[PDB]
């Protein structure tokens, strides 16, 4: 499970 | 601006 | 299952 | 803008 | 199941 | 401006 | 089923 | 500006 | 696990 | 600025 | 001005 | 589907 | 699925 | 002016 | 996905 | 002026 | 994932 | 001025 | 994971 | 003026 923001 | 992925 | 958003 | 997948 | 939405 | 799919 | 829309 | 992921 | 952020 | 891994 | 798609 | 305009 | 505008 | 894709 | 924009 | 791509 | 911007 | 890329 | 700015 | 990188 991962997120990845910018 | 995001991903998210479980 | 996934999201992605801009 | 955005893509939802299960 | 899926949506793309602009 | 949308799809839906199942 | 599906369903696209402009 | 990140990610997380387990 | 692990978290990157700037 | 920072990493955390387990 | 503009095209759109799916 | 489809549209284009000016 | 796309746009695009001038 | 945009280019936008899914 | 991705956006572009002038 | 902007790219954002995932 | 990623950004550029002018 | 900037790039950020994950 | 990385950022360069001017 | 700088970059980060992890």
Given at each position: ?6
């Amino acid at each position: 499970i991962y997120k990845v923001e910018i």
